[PDB]
Write a protein that binds this ligand. Sequence first.
Ligand SMILES: O=c1[nH]c(Oc2cn[nH]c2)nc2cnccc12
Ligand SMILES: [Co+2]
Ligand SMILES: [Zn+2]
Length: 330
Amino acid sequence: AQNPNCNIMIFHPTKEEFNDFDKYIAYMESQGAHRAGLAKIIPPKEWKARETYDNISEILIATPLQQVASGRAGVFTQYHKKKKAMTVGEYRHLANSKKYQTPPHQNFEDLERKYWKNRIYNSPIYGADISGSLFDENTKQWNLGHLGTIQDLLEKECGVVIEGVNTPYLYFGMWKTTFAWHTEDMDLYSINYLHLGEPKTWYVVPPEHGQRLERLARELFPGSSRGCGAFLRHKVALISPTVLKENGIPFNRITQEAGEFMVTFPYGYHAGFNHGFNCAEAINFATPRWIDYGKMASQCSCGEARVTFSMDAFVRILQPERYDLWKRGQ
Ligand SMILES: O=c1[nH]c(Oc2cn[nH]c2)nc2cnccc12
Ligand SMILES: [Co+2]
Ligand SMILES: [Zn+2]
């Protein structure tokens, strides 16, 4: 078995190897990358997503989200308070203001310490989940807007044609903006490219140990757990590395910098935070190996979790037994 300790692996494809996306994902998994739940891919030195990021200030963040925390420093939930629309230019200026700017710090490790000590006492604003792409249409390799769709993958593997499309999303971040512990919808893969700005720190639990995290979450968020059997789908719960370590939960951490890809693998729980103003792009994707994860993925039926148009068909085909009750919630 490759990568038995489930370490986060870092890959350095040549431009040649970077020319077939599906093939390279398969290669990474042949080396055991998926066992970590997360991998980093550093693109070839001659590759670029686009020429410059000089013309992005007019992108609109229609619904910026203020992330308000409740709980203890190492164990908290966050809710999203909707704010008035602003452009990326306006958002960037806000992120860089005295109220929201990254504080002085010695290194990544010091900043991480400051995050977990101080996160709950501030409410940063996140420009998350914006439909769109910053890849140049002429960028041919690893263009997140030109990937094969999950619908076409499902059709290729299971012989069923389904409705739906899947497109990329943009994430404009600032210091302390946070993504809560979760797996992807239907336990899909995700691929995330950090286009510009300050880093993004990730935490991840190996897929083979996901149920250990769930068990701890039920204990740490007893109210949320009773309300919904798959409450992490709400994407609201944070647990610090210190608390994970205290409770024996296997996990790993890594910091993503501008110009780098991160891939999350099926049923790899992850969470993290942004160091300062940045912009990332992400999309879900599937491979043949995902299919069996899709069939087993837990669903929120309490109504809280966000439901996309495309999800209907994946539940309908892969989880016909769940389909009725899942549809009632949504
Ligand atoms: O970088 C990420 N940002 C992000 O934004 C959020 C949307 N809702 N709450 C946070 N979500 C992510 C989810 N999985 C991986 C990376 C991210
Ligand atoms: Co994710
Ligand atoms: Zn729920």
